[PDB]
């Protein structure tokens, strides 16, 4: 069926509540992910703390130890970034939505929202006249299609004397009497039936305005929401994007640094002077 | 105290068994790293399957819907990357260390490594001659400082003769013989104490030389593990680095462009003509 048909704006008004619903959704969606971003960061700092300790108590000293611990550090510094994502999603994006939802929706006392009950009210009194003066027409339709069908009944019960030569005098008098009263009956109904249509076609213009006038407002409101989503999702896109960052490559430019700084020659060197033949020795002498 | 003191070559030998353990530690270190990269991916893909349904089943249609879902996609393509890390870590870095750690370590039929019992036996082979040559000197020490101190007591037997005209020169002869007997036990022992040292010096150049080769043979083997750790870690750093990854930057340049394609006007135009004043209508007529 059509929107212009009485009470079919229902699905345009329903979009309002759906709008409020789509806010909470976009919030939970962001939040639920923000929680995952922290889950990763937390697992990294925990892991780092674990091995930064295991390596410490480990038997592996020297420059290699530093090169090793450099990875525990990268894990931490990565956690710092991902731990920043979380906040960037909640403190900014999430809230920026929560606020928009309140400054756009107002919970009516009874139920639903103000801007929802208003659209309904608006559409109603913007369709009322075209609906009421649609009853005059419809009440005239079943008033004419009842008389116009009543005419054929007279035309039928008029030739009922083609077999029975009964009271012919009183017959052709009454038969041609009812078909005449029915002639004006169908004509007077059509006359008042054409009127109702005029009375409606005159209500149409004003009805075409008030409706679209109430509808246009909804579109504008929905626009503010759509354009708002494109605005938030973009920010979110930048809060997830770590490729377009400089501090990221840094973490992996310095990791390569520390690892390369592992001079094996220098390690064996140290070990040679502290545990190897490089140690002093009181060679046995006369006492 | 010093490495050159007999037996004090354990620290440099214990280094061997440590080298093995260390490998096992670094393997667990990487395994736990990837195991987290996996859990992080699993959480992402499931976050996608989670909301990719809620959005498609939700009241959010049109371009804005696509822009929204566009996020789920980035959440998947990212998860896919961290899964490449898990594999790279376990299939290469890990399987590499494990492989190396077995090709350089062979457990005995008794326990311990063939290379552990390799250096120890080697050290003893080069130190035994020096040790046994020293055990003689050590005995000569409790040989000269046993007759030389035995000499000092011989003077006591004479010093005690200051106010005791006891025996005759007959006894003086008994203490007079110790002049050409006790003194000999000091000049003959000190003479041999010389030999023990002189002869030991003939067994120290060959001693250090030999003791050196063994130690260097450890420096060689140890070097291999060190340089290996460097080679490995370098690769590991590269398997964790998503900075210089072509696919990574693309993910977001693609997400962003997808969100910018979210035309608000596009969605609006559609609704008005599908549920609004745009819909056609059978304006009442004569029947
Ligand atoms: Ca250590
Ligand atoms: Ca949908
Ligand atoms: Cl409220
Ligand atoms: Cl209220």
């Amino acid at each position: 069926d059509s929107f212009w048909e009485v009470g079919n704006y229902k699905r345009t008004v329903k979009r309002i509540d759906d709008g409020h619903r789509l806010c909470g959704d976009l919030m939970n969606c962001l939040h639920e992910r923000a929680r995952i971003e922290k889950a990763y960061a937390q697992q990294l700092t925990e892991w780092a703390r674990r091995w930064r300790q295991l390596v410490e108590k480990g038997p592996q000293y020297g420059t290699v130890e530093k090169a090793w611990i450099a990875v525990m550090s990268e894990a931490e510094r990565v956690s710092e970034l991902h731990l920043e994502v979380k906040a960037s999603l909640m403190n900014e994006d999430f809230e920026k939505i929560k606020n928009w939802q309140k400054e756009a929706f107002h919970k009516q006392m009874m139920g639903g929202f103000k801007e929802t009950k208003e659209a309904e009210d608006g559409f109603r009194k913007a369709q009322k006249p075209w609906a009421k003066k649609l009853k005059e027409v419809e009440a005239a339709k079943k008033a004419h299609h009842t008389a116009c069908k009543e005419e054929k009944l007279a035309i039928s019960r008029e030739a009922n004397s083609k077999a029975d030569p009964s009271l012919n005098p009183e017959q052709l008098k009454k038969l041609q009497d009812k078909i005449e009263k029915c002639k004006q009956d169908v004509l007077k109904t059509k006359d008042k039936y054409e009127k109702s249509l005029k009375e409606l076609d005159q209500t149409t213009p004003q009805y075409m305005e008030n409706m679209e006038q109430v509808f246009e407002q909804c579109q504008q409101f929905e626009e503010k929401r759509l354009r708002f989503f494109r605005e938030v999702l973009l920010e979110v896109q930048k809060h997830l994007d770590l490729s377009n960052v400089a501090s990221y490559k840094t973490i992996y430019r310095e990791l390569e640094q520390s690892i390369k700084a592992a001079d094996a020659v220098e390690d064996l060197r140290w070990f040679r002077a502290n545990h190897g033949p490089g140690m002093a020795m009181n060679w046995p002498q006369f006492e």
Side-chain angles (χ1 to χ4, degrees), chain A:
Chain A
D1 46 20
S2 166
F3 158 85
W4 289 107
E5 215 155 34
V6 292
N8 278 203
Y9 52 87
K10 51 180 181 177
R11 202 160 190 173
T12 213
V13 168
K14 180 196 171 184
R15 209 219 292 106
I16 304 178
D17 304 357
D18 286 351
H20 173 82
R21 179 191 183 280
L22 294 180
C23 284
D25 291 11
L26 183 50
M27 291 197 299
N28 275 176
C29 191
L30 287 173
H31 177 272
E32 289 189 11
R33 161 144 192 176
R35 195 190 312 180
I36 294 183
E37 295 292 345
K38 184 189 80 291
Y40 184 57
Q42 184 174 349
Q43 282 187 335
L44 292 192
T45 47
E46 288 178 4
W47 176 78
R49 160 186 170 178
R50 188 178 194 263
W51 285 97
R52 176 164 292 184
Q53 180 192 208
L54 295 180
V55 171
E56 184 62 25
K57 285 197 172 185
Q60 217 301 140
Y61 300 94
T63 188
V64 173
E65 184 182 4
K66 273 202 167 187
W68 188 327
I69 303 183
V71 177
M72 280 77 271
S73 185
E74 81 85 21
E76 293 165 351
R77 300 174 74 167
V78 163
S79 169
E80 304 180 33
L81 291 180
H82 283 272
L83 211 57
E84 173 55 33
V85 173
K86 165 197 171 183
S88 296
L89 289 178
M90 301 302 303
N91 306 352
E92 312 176 37
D93 303 336
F94 188 92
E95 293 292 343
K96 192 159 171 291
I97 299 181
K98 172 199 284 187
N99 299 334
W100 189 97
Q101 190 180 28
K102 292 203 311 298
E103 289 289 350
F105 293 90
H106 302 261
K107 287 182 175 56
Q108 169 191 164
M109 181 198 63
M110 293 301 308
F113 306 92
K114 188 185 185 66
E115 21 279 340
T116 295
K117 180 187 177 64
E118 287 181 348
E120 191 72 8
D121 293 342
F123 280 113
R124 287 204 325 261
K125 290 203 301 183
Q127 190 186 54
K128 197 176 201 67
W130 183 86
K132 183 183 177 182
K133 269 302 180 64
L134 180 47
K135 292 307 301 176
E136 271 82 356
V137 174
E138 196 59 24
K141 180 186 296 182
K142 195 159 298 180
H144 187 273
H145 287 268
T146 297
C148 174
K149 182 170 58 182
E150 184 62 26
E151 189 174 11
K152 284 299 181 180
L153 177 56
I155 305 180
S156 177
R157 300 184 66 173
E158 175 271 347
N160 287 359
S161 187
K162 67 176 182 179
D164 56 348
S166 54
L167 297 172
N168 297 347
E170 308 294 351
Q171 191 66 12
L172 193 50
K173 176 178 181 177
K174 183 181 181 300
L175 294 183
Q176 196 167 351
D177 184 18
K178 290 292 184 176
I179 65 177
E180 178 57 29
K181 297 179 182 178
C182 192
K183 168 81 278 185
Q184 299 187 11
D185 182 17
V186 179
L187 289 178
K188 73 164 282 68
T189 310
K190 173 182 295 181
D191 197 356
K192 291 184 179 179
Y193 180 83
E194 299 284 8
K195 183 189 299 181
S196 57
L197 292 178
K198 296 183 303 179
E199 298 180 2
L200 183 148
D201 300 333
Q202 295 167 170
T203 304
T204 296
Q206 190 71 197
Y207 163 71
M208 290 274 294
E209 184 183 17
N210 288 341
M211 284 294 294
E212 206 283 335
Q213 188 271 9
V214 174
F215 176 87
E216 187 281 337
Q217 175 58 28
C218 298
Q219 291 295 121
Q220 168 175 325
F221 173 76
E222 192 68 6
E223 173 165 338
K224 300 180 70 178
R225 199 208 74 185
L226 300 176
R227 275 184 158 79
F228 173 81
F229 268 39
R230 204 188 81 105
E231 178 181 0
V232 173
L233 294 181
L234 280 187
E235 298 174 2
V236 170
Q237 168 278 149
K238 195 179 307 174
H239 289 121
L240 294 181
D241 190 22
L242 290 182
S243 70
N244 203 356
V245 188
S247 59
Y248 185 80
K249 300 183 182 181
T250 297
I251 300 185
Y252 289 85
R253 280 184 176 178
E254 295 176 354
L255 211 192
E256 185 174 6
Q257 288 266 218
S258 305
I259 300 185
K260 275 193 170 188
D263 189 346
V265 191
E266 177 174 326
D267 281 21
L268 291 179
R269 265 264 167 164
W270 177 97
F271 191 91
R272 192 188 187 282
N274 292 159
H275 301 275
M279 297 182 68
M281 177 60 181
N282 290 343
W283 301 98
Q285 185 182 356
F286 191 98
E287 305 172 2

Coordinates of all heavy atoms in Angstrom, one line a residue, chain A residues 101-153:
Chain A
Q101 N 22.9 11.7 21.9 CA 21.6 10.9 22.1 C 20.7 11.6 23.1 O 19.5 11.7 22.8 CB 21.9 9.5 22.6 CG 20.7 8.6 22.6 CD 21.1 7.2 23.2 OE1 22.0 7.0 24.0 NE2 20.3 6.2 22.7
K102 N 21.2 12.2 24.1 CA 20.4 13.0 25.1 C 19.9 14.3 24.5 O 18.7 14.6 24.7 CB 21.2 13.2 26.4 CG 21.5 12.0 27.2 CD 21.7 12.3 28.6 CE 22.7 13.5 28.8 NZ 24.1 13.1 28.2
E103 N 20.8 15.0 23.9 CA 20.5 16.3 23.3 C 19.6 16.2 22.0 O 19.5 17.2 21.3 CB 21.7 17.1 23.0 CG 22.5 17.6 24.3 CD 21.7 18.7 25.0 OE1 20.7 19.3 24.4 OE2 22.1 19.1 26.1
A104 N 19.1 15.0 21.8 CA 18.3 14.8 20.6 C 17.0 14.0 20.9 O 16.1 13.9 20.1 CB 19.1 14.0 19.5
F105 N 17.0 13.3 22.1 CA 15.9 12.6 22.5 C 15.4 12.9 23.9 O 16.3 13.2 24.8 CB 16.2 11.1 22.5 CG 16.4 10.5 21.1 CD1 17.6 10.5 20.5 CD2 15.3 10.1 20.3 CE1 17.8 10.1 19.2 CE2 15.4 9.6 19.1 CZ 16.7 9.6 18.5
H106 N 14.1 12.9 24.2 CA 13.6 13.3 25.5 C 12.5 12.2 25.9 O 11.5 12.1 25.2 CB 13.0 14.7 25.4 CG 13.9 15.7 25.0 ND1 14.6 16.5 26.0 CD2 14.4 16.1 23.8 CE1 15.4 17.4 25.3 NE2 15.3 17.2 24.0
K107 N 12.8 11.5 26.9 CA 11.9 10.4 27.4 C 10.6 11.0 27.9 O 10.6 11.6 29.0 CB 12.6 9.5 28.4 CG 13.6 8.6 27.8 CD 14.2 7.7 28.8 CE 15.2 6.7 28.2 NZ 16.2 7.3 27.4
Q108 N 9.5 10.8 27.2 CA 8.2 11.2 27.7 C 7.8 10.5 28.9 O 8.3 9.4 29.2 CB 7.1 10.9 26.6 CG 5.7 11.1 27.0 CD 4.7 10.5 26.0 OE1 3.5 10.2 26.3 NE2 5.2 10.3 24.8
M109 N 7.0 11.1 29.8 CA 6.6 10.4 31.0 C 5.9 9.1 30.8 O 6.4 8.1 31.3 CB 5.6 11.3 31.8 CG 5.2 10.8 33.1 SD 3.7 11.6 33.8 CE 2.5 11.2 32.6
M110 N 4.8 9.1 30.1 CA 4.1 7.9 29.8 C 4.9 6.8 29.2 O 5.1 5.7 29.7 CB 2.9 8.2 28.9 CG 1.8 9.0 29.5 SD 1.1 8.2 31.0 CE 0.7 6.6 30.4
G111 N 5.5 7.1 28.0 CA 6.4 6.2 27.3 C 7.0 6.9 26.1 O 6.6 8.0 25.8
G112 N 7.8 6.1 25.3 CA 8.4 6.6 24.1 C 9.1 7.9 24.3 O 9.5 8.3 25.4
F113 N 9.3 8.7 23.3 CA 10.0 10.0 23.3 C 9.1 11.1 22.8 O 8.2 11.0 22.1 CB 11.3 9.9 22.5 CG 12.2 8.7 22.9 CD1 12.1 7.5 22.3 CD2 13.1 8.9 24.0 CE1 12.9 6.4 22.7 CE2 13.9 7.8 24.4 CZ 13.8 6.6 23.7
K114 N 9.5 12.4 23.3 CA 8.8 13.6 22.9 C 8.7 13.7 21.4 O 7.6 13.8 20.8 CB 9.4 14.8 23.5 CG 8.6 16.1 23.3 CD 9.4 17.3 23.9 CE 8.6 18.5 23.8 NZ 7.4 18.5 24.7
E115 N 9.8 13.7 20.7 CA 9.9 13.9 19.3 C 9.2 12.8 18.5 O 8.9 12.9 17.3 CB 11.3 14.0 18.8 CG 12.4 13.5 19.7 CD 12.7 14.4 20.8 OE1 12.4 15.6 20.7 OE2 13.2 14.0 21.9
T116 N 8.9 11.7 19.2 CA 8.1 10.6 18.6 C 6.6 10.8 18.7 O 5.9 10.8 17.7 CB 8.4 9.2 19.2 OG1 9.8 8.9 19.0 CG2 7.5 8.1 18.7
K117 N 6.1 11.1 19.9 CA 4.7 11.4 20.1 C 4.3 12.7 19.3 O 3.2 12.8 18.9 CB 4.5 11.7 21.6 CG 3.0 12.0 21.9 CD 2.8 12.3 23.4 CE 1.4 12.7 23.7 NZ 0.5 11.6 23.5
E118 N 5.3 13.5 19.0 CA 5.0 14.7 18.2 C 4.8 14.5 16.8 O 3.9 15.0 16.1 CB 6.2 15.8 18.4 CG 6.2 16.4 19.8 CD 7.3 17.4 19.9 OE1 8.2 17.5 19.0 OE2 7.3 18.2 20.9
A119 N 5.6 13.6 16.2 CA 5.4 13.2 14.8 C 4.1 12.6 14.6 O 3.4 12.9 13.6 CB 6.5 12.2 14.3
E120 N 3.7 11.7 15.5 CA 2.4 11.1 15.4 C 1.3 12.1 15.5 O 0.4 12.2 14.6 CB 2.2 10.1 16.6 CG 1.0 9.2 16.6 CD 1.2 8.1 15.5 OE1 2.3 8.0 15.0 OE2 0.2 7.4 15.3
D121 N 1.3 12.9 16.5 CA 0.3 14.0 16.6 C 0.3 14.9 15.3 O -0.8 15.1 14.8 CB 0.7 15.0 17.8 CG 0.6 14.3 19.1 OD1 -0.1 13.2 19.2 OD2 1.2 14.8 20.1
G122 N 1.5 15.2 14.9 CA 1.6 16.0 13.7 C 1.0 15.4 12.4 O 0.1 16.0 11.8
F123 N 1.3 14.1 12.2 CA 0.8 13.4 11.0 C -0.8 13.3 11.2 O -1.5 13.4 10.2 CB 1.4 12.0 10.9 CG 2.7 12.0 10.2 CD1 3.9 11.7 10.9 CD2 2.8 12.4 8.9 CE1 5.1 11.7 10.3 CE2 4.1 12.4 8.2 CZ 5.2 12.0 8.9
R124 N -1.3 13.1 12.4 CA -2.7 12.9 12.6 C -3.5 14.2 12.1 O -4.2 14.1 11.2 CB -3.0 12.7 14.1 CG -2.6 11.3 14.6 CD -3.5 10.9 15.8 NE -3.7 12.1 16.6 CZ -3.0 12.3 17.7 NH1 -2.1 11.5 18.1 NH2 -3.3 13.4 18.5
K125 N -3.3 15.3 12.8 CA -4.0 16.5 12.5 C -3.6 17.1 11.2 O -4.2 18.1 10.7 CB -3.8 17.5 13.6 CG -4.5 17.2 14.9 CD -4.8 18.5 15.7 CE -3.5 19.2 16.1 NZ -3.7 20.4 17.0
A126 N -2.6 16.4 10.5 CA -2.3 16.8 9.1 C -2.9 15.9 8.1 O -2.8 16.1 6.9 CB -0.8 16.8 9.0
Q127 N -3.7 14.9 8.6 CA -4.4 14.0 7.8 C -5.9 13.9 8.1 O -6.7 13.4 7.4 CB -3.7 12.6 7.9 CG -4.2 11.6 6.9 CD -3.7 10.2 7.2 OE1 -3.8 9.7 8.3 NE2 -3.0 9.6 6.2
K128 N -6.2 14.5 9.3 CA -7.6 14.4 9.8 C -8.6 14.9 8.8 O -9.5 14.1 8.5 CB -7.7 15.3 11.1 CG -8.9 15.0 11.9 CD -8.9 15.9 13.2 CE -9.8 15.3 14.3 NZ -9.2 14.0 14.7
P129 N -8.5 16.1 8.2 CA -9.5 16.6 7.3 C -9.6 15.7 6.1 O -10.7 15.3 5.7 CB -8.9 17.9 6.9 CG -8.0 18.3 7.9 CD -7.4 17.1 8.4
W130 N -8.5 15.4 5.4 CA -8.5 14.5 4.2 C -9.1 13.1 4.5 O -9.5 12.4 3.6 CB -7.1 14.4 3.6 CG -7.1 13.6 2.4 CD1 -7.3 14.1 1.1 CD2 -6.8 12.2 2.2 NE1 -7.1 13.1 0.2 CE2 -6.8 11.9 0.8 CE3 -6.5 11.2 3.1 CZ2 -6.6 10.6 0.4 CZ3 -6.2 9.9 2.6 CH2 -6.3 9.7 1.3
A131 N -9.1 12.8 5.8 CA -9.6 11.5 6.2 C -11.1 11.5 6.5 O -11.9 10.7 6.1 CB -8.9 11.0 7.5
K132 N -11.5 12.6 7.2 CA -12.9 12.8 7.5 C -13.7 13.0 6.2 O -14.8 12.4 6.0 CB -13.1 13.9 8.5 CG -14.6 14.2 8.9 CD -14.7 15.4 9.8 CE -16.2 15.6 10.2 NZ -16.4 16.8 11.0
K133 N -13.3 14.0 5.4 CA -14.0 14.2 4.1 C -13.7 13.1 3.1 O -14.1 13.2 2.0 CB -13.5 15.6 3.5 CG -14.4 16.8 4.0 CD -15.8 16.5 3.6 CE -16.7 17.7 4.0 NZ -16.3 19.0 3.3
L134 N -13.1 12.1 3.6 CA -12.9 10.9 2.8 C -14.1 9.9 3.1 O -14.4 9.0 2.4 CB -11.6 10.2 3.0 CG -11.3 8.9 2.2 CD1 -11.6 9.1 0.8 CD2 -9.8 8.5 2.4
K135 N -14.7 10.1 4.3 CA -15.8 9.3 4.7 C -17.1 9.7 4.0 O -17.9 8.9 3.6 CB -16.0 9.4 6.2 CG -14.9 8.8 7.0 CD -14.7 7.4 6.6 CE -16.0 6.5 6.7 NZ -15.8 5.1 6.2
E136 N -17.3 11.0 3.8 CA -18.4 11.5 3.0 C -18.4 10.9 1.7 O -19.5 10.4 1.2 CB -18.4 13.1 2.9 CG -19.1 13.8 4.0 CD -18.2 14.0 5.2 OE1 -17.1 13.4 5.2 OE2 -18.6 14.7 6.2
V137 N -17.2 10.8 1.1 CA -17.1 10.2 -0.2 C -17.4 8.7 -0.2 O -18.2 8.2 -1.0 CB -15.7 10.4 -0.8 CG1 -15.5 9.6 -2.1 CG2 -15.4 11.9 -1.0
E138 N -16.7 8.0 0.8 CA -16.9 6.5 0.9 C -18.3 6.1 1.3 O -18.8 5.1 0.9 CB -15.8 6.0 1.9 CG -15.7 4.5 1.8 CD -15.2 4.0 0.4 OE1 -14.6 4.9 -0.3 OE2 -15.5 2.9 0.0
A139 N -18.9 7.0 2.1 CA -20.3 6.8 2.5 C -21.3 7.0 1.3 O -22.4 6.5 1.3 CB -20.7 7.6 3.7
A140 N -20.8 7.8 0.4 CA -21.6 8.1 -0.8 C -21.4 7.0 -1.9 O -22.3 6.8 -2.7 CB -21.3 9.5 -1.4
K141 N -20.2 6.4 -1.8 CA -19.9 5.3 -2.8 C -20.8 4.1 -2.6 O -21.3 3.5 -3.5 CB -18.4 4.9 -2.7 CG -18.0 3.8 -3.6 CD -16.6 3.3 -3.3 CE -15.6 4.4 -3.6 NZ -14.2 3.9 -3.4
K142 N -21.0 3.7 -1.3 CA -21.8 2.6 -1.0 C -23.3 3.1 -0.9 O -24.2 2.4 -0.4 CB -21.4 2.0 0.4 CG -22.0 0.6 0.6 CD -21.2 -0.2 1.6 CE -19.8 -0.5 1.1 NZ -19.0 -1.3 2.0
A143 N -23.5 4.3 -1.3 CA -24.8 4.9 -1.4 C -25.3 5.0 -2.8 O -26.5 4.9 -3.1 CB -24.9 6.3 -0.8
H144 N -24.3 5.0 -3.7 CA -24.6 5.1 -5.2 C -24.5 3.7 -5.8 O -25.3 3.3 -6.6 CB -23.6 6.0 -5.9 CG -23.9 6.2 -7.3 ND1 -23.4 5.4 -8.3 CD2 -24.6 7.2 -7.9 CE1 -23.8 5.9 -9.5 NE2 -24.6 6.9 -9.3
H145 N -23.5 2.9 -5.3 CA -23.3 1.5 -5.8 C -24.4 0.6 -5.2 O -24.5 -0.5 -5.5 CB -21.9 1.0 -5.4 CG -20.8 1.6 -6.2 ND1 -20.3 1.0 -7.4 CD2 -20.1 2.7 -6.0 CE1 -19.4 1.7 -7.9 NE2 -19.2 2.8 -7.1
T146 N -25.3 1.2 -4.4 CA -26.4 0.5 -3.9 C -27.7 0.9 -4.6 O -28.6 0.1 -4.8 CB -26.6 0.8 -2.4 OG1 -25.5 0.4 -1.6 CG2 -27.9 0.1 -1.8
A147 N -27.7 2.1 -5.1 CA -28.8 2.6 -5.9 C -28.6 2.3 -7.4 O -29.6 1.9 -8.1 CB -29.0 4.1 -5.7
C148 N -27.4 2.4 -7.9 CA -27.1 2.1 -9.2 C -27.3 0.6 -9.5 O -27.6 0.2 -10.6 CB -25.6 2.4 -9.6 SG -25.1 1.9 -11.2
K149 N -27.1 -0.2 -8.4 CA -27.4 -1.6 -8.5 C -28.9 -1.9 -8.2 O -29.4 -2.9 -8.6 CB -26.6 -2.4 -7.5 CG -26.8 -3.9 -7.5 CD -25.7 -4.6 -6.6 CE -25.8 -4.1 -5.2 NZ -24.7 -4.8 -4.3
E150 N -29.6 -0.9 -7.7 CA -31.0 -1.0 -7.4 C -31.8 -0.7 -8.7 O -32.9 -1.1 -8.8 CB -31.4 0.0 -6.3 CG -32.8 0.0 -5.9 CD -33.2 -1.4 -5.3 OE1 -32.3 -2.0 -4.8 OE2 -34.4 -1.7 -5.4
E151 N -31.1 0.0 -9.6 CA -31.8 0.4 -10.9 C -31.9 -0.9 -11.7 O -33.0 -1.1 -12.3 CB -30.9 1.4 -11.6 CG -31.6 2.0 -12.8 CD -30.8 3.1 -13.4 OE1 -29.6 3.3 -13.0 OE2 -31.3 3.8 -14.3
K152 N -30.9 -1.7 -11.8 CA -30.9 -2.9 -12.6 C -31.9 -3.9 -12.0 O -32.4 -4.8 -12.7 CB -29.5 -3.5 -12.7 CG -28.6 -2.8 -13.7 CD -29.1 -2.9 -15.1 CE -28.2 -2.2 -16.1 NZ -28.7 -2.2 -17.5
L153 N -32.2 -3.7 -10.8 CA -33.2 -4.6 -10.1 C -34.6 -4.2 -10.6 O -35.4 -5.1 -10.8 CB -33.1 -4.4 -8.6 CG -34.2 -5.2 -7.8 CD1 -34.1 -6.7 -8.1 CD2 -34.0 -4.9 -6.3

